[PDB]
Amino acid sequence: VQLVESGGGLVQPGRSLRLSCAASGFTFDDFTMHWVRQVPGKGLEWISSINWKGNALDYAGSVRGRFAISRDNAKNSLYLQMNSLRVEDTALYYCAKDFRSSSSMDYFYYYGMGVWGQGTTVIVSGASTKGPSVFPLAPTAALGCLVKDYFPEPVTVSWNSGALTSGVHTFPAVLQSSGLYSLSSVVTVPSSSLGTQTYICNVNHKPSNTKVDKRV
Amino acid sequence: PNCLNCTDLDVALGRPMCMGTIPSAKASILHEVRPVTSGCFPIMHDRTKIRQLPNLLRGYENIRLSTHNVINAERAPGGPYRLGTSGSCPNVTSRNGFFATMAWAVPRKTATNPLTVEVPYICTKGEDQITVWGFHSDDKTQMKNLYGDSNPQKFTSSANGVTTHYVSQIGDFPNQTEDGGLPQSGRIVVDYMVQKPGKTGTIVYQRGVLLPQKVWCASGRSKVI
Amino acid sequence: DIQMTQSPSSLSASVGDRVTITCQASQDIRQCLNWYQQKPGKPPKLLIYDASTLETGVPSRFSGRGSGTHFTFTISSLQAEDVATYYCQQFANVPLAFGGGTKVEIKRTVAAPSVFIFPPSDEQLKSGTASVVCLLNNFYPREAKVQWKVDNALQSGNSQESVTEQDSKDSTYSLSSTLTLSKADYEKHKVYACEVTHQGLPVTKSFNRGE
Ligand SMILES: *[C@@H]1O[C@H](CO)[C@@H](O[C@@H]2O[C@H](CO)[C@@H](O[C@@H]3O[C@H](CO)[C@@H](O)[C@H](O)[C@@H]3O)[C@H](O)[C@H]2NC(C)=O)[C@H](O)[C@H]1NC(C)=O
Ligand SMILES: *[C@@H]1O[C@H](CO[C@@H]2O[C@H](CO)[C@@H](O[C@@H]3O[C@H](CO)[C@@H](O)[C@H](O)[C@@H]3O)[C@H](O)[C@H]2NC(C)=O)[C@@H](O)[C@H](O)[C@H]1NC(C)=O
């Protein structure tokens, strides 16, 4: 069972955007589908829920009249068309499967949400996208990369292109006084592996299309 | 039958929580000239003769509901169908339920031709079989969400030589009377056809049909006062 | 609307302790509650549904109990990988409400943080800004005081911190302090030192400009 959220990014307040949830691994047209957002730092907030058909739609009050939920049982995709966006729509939007194949058709088709996706980041802001600057951290030993001056969140840092995950510490971003973000990523490596071992960090910022991933 | 809250027509419809052991009696009193359901999904009862179903049932000394479904509703003509439930019909294990006598053949969406179904006499050698059926109809925009047709749907059943017709209603639904009290968008019409021993029943239908599952097997005669 | 008053707000307990979380409802839901665990920065996994039944694969030390308006979630023996933010959620009414959440962290021994220092790189001083980094790695408790010292002088307001969550294994934290200066200010002083204050370690890791 997989749930993949896509389409989240930087948008103006009041404009439109649409997320897509591509499902696979189970009979999508039998279950009711959910939407839950989580603004960074706070907890889970339910957005909307569509049943196995498109006949029944439920909306939380904060989004009623602005958002629209839909689904395609052929291409097993859940949709959420958000309109008249507000800055407090900035959150991490989760796509959720309801465990029960309840053909309620009236009410109560929502239950324990068994399966969740990894979410997509939505930040409603009228600010400038800024592409990150990647600086190394000069060195059992310890090394890392420094990513400075970027907007908005998030950013992805990989080490040895995903092979090296042991002893990795990627710190939460710090919103600097200028309005840009700055985090750091370090990994502890033995002192034997300075020769014969090159350590490389994968820094990618999708809003600025600025990946070019560089070596330490 | 020691069961609670549940009216006589309510048991006659197979409403959840009103499945129960039906005793036999050789004398019966008639106390409801207008049988009333306090439970299951809202019904436009006067559209058909459905009100006289339980009073017809008591006329038989021995009455019992079929243990197995008369048909399996998922593979009926017209594409695979889901089996319907509802919140107005609380199943003690699930906030949703429905009649045990019928099924909601709701398509997985295109206009369809009239579909024909024969109904067997699965009941025993001599007991008269009452077959209960019906159709749902909602307003225009939900008929589109539910079915592939916002036009009125055609229905007709035939058994024992009695050939009836029906046509569903869209919009302007009467308020919700004699139900579970939860605000719905659509309405339900219920009718029954009786099948003599050995004979079959026929039902021609379109989108919105309620296919039967549990049919009555009634025998004997009970005096009525 | 039904408000989920989840409690506690945040707790801490040693490994093996009994952890208990209560969730009240303002109105009767009667079974339609279920508990989620937050793997940090990762999805929610369902542990308890219908307030007492146990999900496929989740261990036996997790238990839920309650009905009506009072519900109880209990971890019989707290483990280190249980560090998470747990959420209750009622699905008895058409609007869905999630509890405020409870942060779970491990009470362990005192761990001394490994201290390293990183000067501003050749690439960064090309721009005209200097960012000096001091790493506090794998320590407990969370509280730690680090003060920057430039040519034997305390700075204030020139740096920012970022702490990782408690790691699923070894139940420690890791801290990053980022001293930021203009290149005009970085080449006016020479010795940069990082003085930390913890229980396990006064310790200073310093570097000289370009050595
Ligand atoms: C409350 O609703 C449930 C769900 O409709 C009713 O339970 C039904 O129980 C029957 C008893 O034989 C189950 O039978 C078989 O289960 C398999 C596997 O799910 C299914 O594929 C077969 O078609 C057959 O029905 C059945 O699981 C279950 N119904 C469904 C649709 O799964 C129950 O009778 C209702 N009333 C109560 C519990 O009072
Ligand atoms: C059953 O019918 C419902 C319509 O009935 C009324 O609908 C109006 C909604 O505007 C409400 O009536 C109010 O009544 C006051 C006097 O009692 C008026 O002064 C006031 O202005 C307002 O009109 C009320 O909610 C409701 N009352 C009653 C007794 O029904 C309709 O809304 C439902 O959907 C329908 N339900 C079904 C299942 O068909």
TrEMBL record, chain B:
Q: Where in the cell is it found?
A: Host apical cell membrane; Virion membrane
Q: How is it modified after translation?
A: Palmitoylated. In natural infection, inactive HA is matured into HA1 and HA2 outside the cell by one or more trypsin-like, arginine-specific endoprotease secreted by the bronchial epithelial cells. One identified protease that may be involved in this process is secreted in lungs by club cells.
Q: What intrachain disulfides are recorded?
A: C6-C18
Q: What does this protein do?
A: Binds to sialic acid-containing receptors on the cell surface, bringing about the attachment of the virus particle to the cell. This attachment induces virion internalization of about two third of the virus particles through clathrin-dependent endocytosis and about one third through a clathrin- and caveolin-independent pathway. Plays a major role in the determination of host range restriction and virulence. Class I viral fusion protein. Binds to sialic acid-containing receptors on the cell surface, bringing about the attachment of the virus particle to the cell. Plays a major role in the determination of host range restriction and virulence. Class I viral fusion protein. Responsible for penetration of the virus into the cell cytoplasm by mediating the fusion of the membrane of the endocytosed virus particle with the endosomal membrane. Low pH in endosomes induce an irreversible conformational change in HA2, releasing the fusion hydrophobic peptide. Several trimers are required to form a competent fusion pore.
Q: How does it assemble?
A: Homotrimer of disulfide-linked HA1-HA2.
Family, similarity comment: Belongs to the influenza viruses hemagglutinin family.
Protein name, per record: Hemagglutinin
Q: Which gene encodes it?
A: HA
Q: Which residues of the full protein are shown?
A: 70 to 296 of 583
